[PDB]
């Protein structure tokens, strides 16, 4: 007894090699090793005929394509002067503000990210033929659809990733298919006679994509799952961590909209996206691991983990997936501490780089809504600032769209809350978004949804308070200037429509205390929540408001109504009688020295097209941008401009001086 030592003898190539492996020495310094367990798994006394039959049971890739891929430089060199932070030792005396350089050490970051430990290669049927049972510090992404009839596991480590598909046919004969991505040198150890070359589908100079399955399971999976592993591996190797995360996020966002994941099908693209979610979560951990005992700049970590946080939320929405691991509490403490150094109300008074950096830190330090609602005041402060410096009615620029997209997630998180303490700021954010949702913006977003570019991923129209965006109007606002194919355009209109469904928890009001004053909600066109007043602009009369105007529309052409609600307190009943006329104003001087319209709204519509623009007069600059441009075109008699005031009055601007 008392396992001590084994001697290995080799007669290879003449000279006799003799080695001595002492069990008791390397067993006392490696506590997580069991030699007898691997000896049992080995089946050392298995005959060659039986080993051969186990070997033929497993499907083998007939042809391995050699593609040369260029992996990028993800983590930059440590910035000179960066304070190094131990993820385990983070105190308030750590980095002062968002301008002082900082980086987190890689080793304690990895110890916190891959904190949990578990079995990665189970003793289940398909894996037990080829792999030895492996148990490591891991982090998994698990999801299931069709009521446990389809399951995907996304177990991963700092060195390789294994995604396992399992399908139950409701009668038996579970089908399992595993894909292993990672460095060819870091791949797990194989069992028995199996060799890695005969199992890799795609391979690079340093990376490999292995497939582990049986011939029967392979032929069964092939009827409904034929993925393009070449391009999949190519993106997994060549793309950066944050870019790959954003790519998978855009795929899932287009899937969530257009009603794709309410009844998820066992489609090839679906399972492909399931694997790509695991790869997205794996590339960040792998990049941190490839820089052992170094440190990662805080800006790179902020970007990557913002992307991962958003991706986690979306997979929790569509599939109710679970992500255990890949979350350092030290990074969260650091981000939440940096959040106390900048005041939210003036976050827009900073650099665009600083705004995006603060917003990424905001969603990373406070990932769950309801802990610190003040972050909404920050995001609004960004949007407000952008709205002041953005050309009126023009589509959003790429940089601005990305900034507003990074900021929009705290708002989306708070709009889904059943009770909030930041109602007014949500109202201001949604009013600003309604103001920014012009015809050019809708056209650019439709073009981005058609072409599949980054313009369609986010838009202020998605948080706008516009309810007059049916298909017949979206098609009219479709660009049609580019050579569009009317198929992508139809699907883009349908997707843009679905993203605005009020069935979405962030689309129904639930936070505009005046949305209850309406009795025919299917006829609401717009909601303008100003200060001390909210205007319900609808094509119906039954609105329990404080007054009732009727605008000038062409005969038999879907009349327009504006019902103001003071203090968001509904009336005891619908204001009966005859709707009052909108007073025309001609004596407004075009020259102004003070912001006399500050806090008001300016709505231009058409007699047979509908609502056209919406402006929130938020500063002297915006007022002068409106008065001193071609915005007022009194020559066109079909366009009417309405001014909405804070005491509930609606005027019609028909002349100036």
């Amino acid at each position, epitope marked *: 007894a008392s396992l001590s030592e084994v001697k290995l003898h080799l007669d290879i190539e003449g000279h006799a090699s003799h080695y001595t492996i002492p069990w008791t020495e390397l067993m006392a310094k490696v506590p997580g090793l069991s030699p007898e367990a691997l000896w049992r798994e080995a089946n050392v006394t298995e005959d060659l005929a039986s080993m051969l039959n186990r070997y033929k049971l497993i499907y083998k890739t007939s042809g391995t394509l050699g593609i040369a891929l260029a992996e990028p430089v993800d983590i930059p060199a440590v910035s000179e002067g960066s304070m190094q932070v131990d993820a385990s030792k983070v105190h308030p005396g750590v980095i002062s503000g968002l301008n002082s350089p900082a980086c987190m050490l890689s080793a304690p970051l990895e110890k916190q990210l891959f904190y949990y430990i578990g079995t990665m290669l189970p003793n289940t049927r398909p894996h037990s033929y080829v792999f030895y049972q492996l148990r490591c510090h891991l982090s998994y992404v698990a999801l299931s659809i069709n009521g446990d009839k389809f399951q995907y596991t996304g177990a991963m480590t700092s060195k390789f990733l294994m995604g396992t598909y399992k399908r139950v046919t409701e009668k038996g004969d579970e089908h399992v298919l595993s894909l292993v991505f990672g460095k060819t040198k870091d791949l797990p150890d194989l069992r028995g006679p199996f060799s890695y070359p005969s199992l890799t589908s795609a391979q690079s100079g340093d990376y490999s994509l292995v497939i582990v399955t049986t011939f029967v399971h392979y032929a069964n999976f092939h009827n409904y799952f034929v993925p393009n592993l070449k391009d999949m591996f190519s993106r997994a190797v060549t793309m950066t961590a944050a870019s790959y995360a954003r790519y998978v996020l855009q795929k899932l966002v287009l899937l969530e909209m257009k009603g794709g994941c309410r009844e998820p099908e066992l489609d090839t693209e679906t399972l492909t996206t399931m694997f790509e979610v695991s790869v997205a979560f794996f590339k960040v951990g792998h990049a941190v691991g490839e820089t052992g005992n170094g440190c990662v700049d805080l800006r790179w970590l902020a970007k990557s983990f913002f992307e991962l946080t958003v991706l986690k939320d979306i997979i929790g929405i569509c599939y109710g997936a679970t992500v255990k691991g890949m979350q350092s509490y030290g990074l969260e403490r650091l981000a939440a501490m940096l959040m106390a150094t900048v005041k939210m109300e003036e976050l827009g008074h900073l650099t665009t780089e600083k705004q995006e950096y603060a917003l990424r830190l905001a969603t990373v330090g406070y990932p769950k809504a309801g802990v610190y609602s003040g972050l909404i005041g920050g995001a609004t402060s960004v949007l407000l600032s952008a709205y002041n410096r953005h050309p009126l009615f023009q589509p959003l620029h790429t940089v601005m769209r990305e900034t507003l997209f990074i900021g929009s997630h705290v708002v989306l998180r708070e709009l889904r809350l059943n009770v909030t303490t930041q109602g007014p700021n949500l109202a201001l954010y949604q009013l600003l978004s309604t103001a920014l949702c012009s015809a050019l913006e809708i056209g650019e977003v439709l073009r981005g949804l058609a072409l599949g570019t980054e313009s369609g991923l986010f838009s202020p129209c998605y948080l706008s308070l516009r309810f007059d965006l049916t298909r017949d109007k979206l098609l009219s606002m479709a660009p049609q200037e580019a050579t569009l194919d009317q198929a992508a355009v139809s699907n883009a209109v349908d997707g843009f429509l679905g993203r605005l469904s*009020l069935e979405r928890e962030d689309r*129904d009001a639930w936070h505009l205390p005046a*949305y209850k004053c309406v009795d025919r*909600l299917d006829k609401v066109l717009m909601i303008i929540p100003l200060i001390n007043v909210t205007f319900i602009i609808s094509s119906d009369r039954e609105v329990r408001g404080s007054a009732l105007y009727e605008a000038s529309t062409t005969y038999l052409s879907s009349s327009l109504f504006l019902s103001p609600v003071i203090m968001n307190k509904c009336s*005891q009943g619908a204001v009966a009688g005859e709707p009052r006329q909108i007073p025309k104003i001609q004596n407004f001087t075009r020259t102004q020295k003070s912001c006399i319209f500050c806090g008001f709204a300016l709505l231009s519509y058409d007699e047979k097209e509908g609502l056209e623009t919406t402006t929130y007069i938020t500063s002297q600059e915006v007022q002068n941008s409106i008065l001193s441009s071609n915005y007022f075109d009194f020559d066109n008699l079909h366009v009417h401009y309405l001014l909405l005031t804070t005491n509930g009055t609606v005027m019609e601007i028909a002349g100036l001086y």
Partner: antibody, heavy 125, light 109 residues
Framework: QVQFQQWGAGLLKPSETLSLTCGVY????????WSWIRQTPGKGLEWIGE???????NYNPSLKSRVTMSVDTSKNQFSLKMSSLTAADTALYYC???????????????????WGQGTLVTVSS | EIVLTQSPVSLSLSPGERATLSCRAS???????LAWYQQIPGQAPRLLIY???SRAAGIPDRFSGGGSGTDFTLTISRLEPEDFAVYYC?????????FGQGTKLEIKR
């Protein structure tokens, strides 16, 4: 405000089934959950169920084995059916609307505003 | 599920006095999920106060809802003859809605 008109049988035999139908006037079914509330003379105010303009139903767990509710959006109406009646099911049946719109599913219930006039359903042989 | 016991069962005050009604819950519930209704016999119930504190449209300032946790109150000051009714408390936070037994108030003469 929104007004209701309810029609349905008054006298019903025990083993039979109650069928009622409320029609909404002055508003639209889109966006709200419409509920049925019964009240036995003297006692009362028991919530039966609710339905939205799409078809999502939420029944009282004490009656979910006997109660079904349906909608007709083209007529702005919603109907209730309650089988396996007993002499204890005679009551004034009101139909009311939630005082606030509820479009999404992951969303709590709301207060009733407004209520309709209840009709007396008498279960007797 | 949640049971709401009202107090008192009967109540009679003179014009101008202040009537305090009480509603006790068997568990804890959010104050944001509570309503008080007024029902004049022979008419449909009229919403008085939603959210346990917010007055509905048309209800005058002499109606006030307070309380939290497990105890809620409805105070009706400066009583008028029109205030004769049965008043009910309701909660809409648990899985089934529930109402109270009610308090019938008569205005003296």
């Amino acid at each position: 405000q929104v007004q209701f008109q309810q029609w349905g049988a008054g006298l019903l035999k025990p083993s039979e089934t109650l069928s009622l139908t409320c029609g909404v006037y002055g508003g639209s079914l889109s966006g709200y959950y419409w509920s049925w509330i019964r009240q036995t003379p003297g006692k009362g105010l028991e919530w039966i169920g609710e339905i939205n303009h799409t078809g999502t139903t939420n029944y009282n767990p004490s009656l979910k084995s006997r109660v079904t509710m349906s909608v007709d959006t083209s007529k702005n109406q919603f109907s209730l059916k309650m089988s396996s009646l007993t002499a204890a099911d005679t009551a004034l049946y009101y139909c009311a609307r939630e005082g606030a719109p509820r479009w999404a599913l992951k969303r709590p219930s709301n207060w009733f505003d407004p209520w309709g006039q209840g009709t007396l359903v008498t279960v007797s042989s | 599920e949640i049971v709401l016991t009202q107090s008192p069962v009967s109540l009679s005050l003179s014009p101008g006095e202040r009537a305090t009604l009480s509603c006790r819950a068997s568990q804890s519930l959010s104050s944001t999920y509570l309503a008080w209704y007024q029902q004049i016999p022979g008419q449909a119930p009229r919403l008085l106060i939603y959210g346990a504190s917010s007055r509905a449209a048309g209800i005058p300032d002499r109606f006030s809802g307070g309380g939290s946790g497990t105890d809620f109150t409805l105070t009706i000051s400066r009583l008028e003859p029109e205030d004769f009714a049965v008043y009910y408390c309701q909660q809409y936070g648990s899985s089934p809605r529930s109402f109270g037994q009610g308090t019938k108030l008569e205005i003296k003469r």
